Design a protein around this ligand. Structure first.
Ligand SMILES: Cc1cc2nc3c(=O)[nH]c(=O)nc-3n(C[C@H](O)[C@H](O)[C@H](O)COP(=O)(O)OP(=O)(O)OC[C@H]3O[C@@H](n4cnc5c(N)ncnc54)[C@H](O)[C@@H]3O)c2cc1C
Ligand SMILES: Cc1cc2nc3c(=O)[nH]c(=O)nc-3n(C[C@H](O)[C@H](O)[C@H](O)COP(=O)(O)OP(=O)(O)OC[C@H]3O[C@@H](n4cnc5c(N)ncnc54)[C@H](O)[C@@H]3O)c2cc1C
Ligand SMILES: Nc1ccnc2cc(Cl)ccc12
Ligand SMILES: Nc1ccnc2cc(Cl)ccc12
Lengths: 432, 434
């Protein structure tokens, strides 16, 4: 299309939430999503969890899964019939939402409210949302290695990554995961379950002393590492990769402490790099501390440009400047951007929550500023709650195997109350 | 009496506010603009307070507040240009009203409302924060007694010019603490006045020379000699340790062995941005440069802009900055007013600053001017200083070269990597490289 009122750059979780937010407040809105991926907007969490614990051997083709409730759903937010074609977008009665897949915005002209695509096309907009997300980081050791090593290394984020790694797990006998965060630990439990049926091997190495060493306190991180080992995973904590090479066709990971790991494939889950390529041509400011596009409390960068999702470094009126990489955050920030793109002028207020499932026995939700560096107070009874403190106020909460009580945690963070006894606060989560 | 509602609300009654009011009115001929000023005076420009008003021939200059540039007043406009705040929502085609002697003490961004120090509440449709900044003080003078604090002057407002002018006619020794442009301008002003009364003027600062933070050492040293020849006792490399009163006179004890006895002290040691309203308003402050953090359009939130000294903004060409120049307050205020009327345009036109150290020394500058940056100077009495970063000119200082600032502005905008800066110097009519 030559011109479109609402232009959403990127076809991920934040863009879809913004589109349906715009449509809700402007029933006749014409919204164009431009996505470099060939897929329609879809959610990613199932790519490292539900899709691996499915009984259907065609799950790689159907891309459907059963939720905690039990109802089956697809990873796509909506079926193709819910969208309109970009050709019909500036004609169809009552407008709609179109997705232009396989196209990447490569130049942003803020002055003329115009974007240029990788095929030379130019599109003008009235209001634009940057929801480009981010790219998985790689390891310098794997970068210094040859093509043989890189060709046997997976960066997990997209649907293709799930289908390729699922295919690898059925072809090799040993897969090593590098990274102790949520993604690395979830893929370990997933491959561990998948490995128990074929008798294969799953290794996980990371620099910390336990899984989520940057997020959970030491004692809980250590307890988690044992739960992951119970899933059939060989966990190698305190491991820093010095170099990676190929010897006799097998991958050989040399660690800084002298240890060596022989494996067939490597999955690198070592953080995310925000896609801020369009800031150069667009003259958009990026945040040197947190990375990403720097935006205000309303997720706004310029008069008619907002940013949401993983790529948005925003100002939290309550918690300070932040950048968050959570699914619910992309939904909340995307939804908020769409509202502000229709005159709402609302600041980021409703905090988002993140969750993670390390097998069917372990599952944690969380909200706010969750960092192992901050002081923590853990109350337990298999079940517990972790409070994250700063200036004598609770700024982050982790709920360990406690569900359907996130609104309670959200209220504690908002009230900013100075609690004399957190043990009493733990009763709000049914801990006694 | 302030109206309960006003379309445009400008907080602060300084240079940035006035420029925004003119801008708003030029784009919305019926705009109703309310300025709220904690000062009792109408908006006025400050550069004359340290320069032209001291070199005036009129002995009534302290009363008239007029100077020759053509003669004009320090006020941007006479009271006739303004309407009253009470009649602002009734006058046909609106106008600009100034509510003096009132301070905004609370900012509710959610409800687009402010609260004044008297309890008055004013809602707005669009708002500009133009609060400027407060002069800093020295910890040594903060630890001193009331006698010292009573004999210390923080120079910024009209009252400071009138109080210091009367003191220069009553005491024998005035010491200026601060080697920046303000301290140097006041030294040349008091030195010119002291040569006629037989008094003394002292200027001390920690740097090796005047404007040591701005100009290269060789140019800062040359400037210190001209200030000295204006009849000033300049004391470089001076760090104050304590200040006290002895035998009715002020005694300044420096970190080294030197001691200075004087009658009055003038501190020109920088500015502190007035960001008090950021707490209640939930507005972000910049921890590096200070001030309110705003984007390239000077916007903080949907209906709140910030201009002037208090605005930490994003320069698409030069990076995040905060500038404390008169022309910047004009340019950034005019830009804010345009954006408050839908312009949606970024800070693009670079502001210039200038300084006159007597009638024989005149500096003009533009861009990122910092002595820490690598510099290249080309001279012929006159010269140009190029401030470099990434092999590109990011700042220019023009030494006794006038009516060529648009040329300097183009060099910085073009971002060209010049193979020879002597050829670039010829654009300023320079034909000694340092
Ligand atoms: C495997 C996996 C599991 C996860 N599990 C969880 C979980 O359990 N809980 C949780 O809270 N979070 C989870 N997350 C994080 C959550 O998925 C992310 O926060 C969320 O996907 C971010 O959405 P987004 O809109 O910000 O960006 P993205 O989802 O990254 O979407 C951006 C899209 O824009 C495209 N794009 C980028 N640049 C351009 C351009 N110039 N032009 C056009 N298109 C462009 C990108 O290709 C991508 O398609 C998981 C993430 C992954 C990868
Ligand atoms: C003596 C002097 C000489 C100078 N000479 C030069 C020069 O030669 N060249 C040059 O380039 N620059 C010069 N400057 C710098 C230039 O004057 C400043 O950059 C300019 O005045 C900045 O304007 P502003 O509108 O941002 O703020 P200000 O001029 O400080 O105006 C802010 C006003 O808002 C008021 N205010 C603050 N908070 C509130 C509140 N909550 N409610 C109501 N009112 C409030 C303050 O009292 C003040 O009256 C000089 C400055 C001084 C002090
Ligand atoms: N369970 C998760 C919680 C938060 N963030 C995540 C990011 C990734 Cl990439 C994968 C899983 C996550
Ligand atoms: N001549 C000046 C140039 C730039 N900035 C100045 C700031 C002050 Cl406070 C006083 C004079 C100045």
């Amino acid at each position: 299309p030559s011109h479109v009122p609402f232009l959403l750059i990127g076809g991920g979780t934040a863009a879809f939430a913004a589109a349906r937010s715009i449509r809700a407040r402007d029933p006749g809105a014409r919204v164009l999503i431009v996505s470099e991926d060939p897929e329609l907007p879809y959610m990613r969490p199932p790519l490292s969890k539900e899709l691996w614990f499915s009984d259907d051997p065609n799950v790689t083709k159907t891309l459907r899964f059963k939720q905690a409730n039990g109802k089956e759903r697809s990873i796509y937010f909506q079926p193709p019939s819910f969208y309109v074609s970009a050709q019909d977008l500036p004609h169809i009665e009552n407008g709609g939402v179109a997705v232009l897949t396989g196209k990447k915005v490569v130049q942003l002209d803020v002055r003329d409210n115009m974007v240029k695509l990788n095929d030379g096309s130019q599109i003008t907009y009235e209001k634009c949302l940057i929801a480009t997300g981010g790219t998985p980081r790689s390891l310098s050791a794997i970068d210094r290695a040859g093509a043989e090593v890189k060709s046997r290394t997976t960066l997990f984020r997209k649907i293709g990554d799930f289908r390729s790694l699922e295919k690898i797990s059925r072809e090799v006998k040993s897969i090593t995961i590098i990274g102790g965060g949520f993604l690395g630990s979830e893929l370990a439990c997933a491959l561990g379950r998948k490995a128990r049926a074929l008798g294969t091997e799953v290794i996980q190495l990371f620099p910390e002393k336990g899984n989520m060493g940057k997020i959970l306190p030491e004692y809980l991180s250590n307890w988690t590492m044992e739960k992951v080992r119970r899933e059939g995973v060989k966990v190698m904590p305190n491991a820093i990769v010095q170099s990676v090479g190929v010897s006799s066709g097998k991958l050989l990971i040399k660690l800084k402490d002298g240890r060596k790991v022989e494996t067939d494939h490597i999955v690198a889950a070592v953080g995310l790099e925000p896609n801020v390529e369009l800031a150069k041509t667009g003259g958009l400011e990026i945040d040197s501390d947190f990375g990403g596009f720097r935006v205000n409390a309303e997720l706004q960068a310029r008069s008619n440009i907002w940013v949401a999702g993983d790529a948005a470094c925003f100002y939290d009126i309550k918690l300070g400047r932040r950048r968050v990489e959570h699914h619910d955050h992309a939904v909340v920030s995307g939804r908020l951007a769409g509202e502000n793109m229709t005159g709402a002028a609302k600041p980021y207020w409703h905090q988002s929550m993140f969750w993670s499932d390390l097998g069917p026995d372990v599952g944690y939700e969380a909200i706010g500023l969750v960092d192992s560096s901050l002081p923590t107070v853990g109350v337990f009874a298999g079940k517990g709650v972790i409070f994250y403190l700063r200036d004598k106020v609770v700024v982050g909460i982790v709920l360990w195997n406690i569900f359907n009580r996130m609104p309670i945690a959200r209220k504690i963070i908002k009230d900013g109350e100075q609690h004399e006894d957190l043990n009493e606060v733990a009763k709000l989560f049914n801990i006694h």
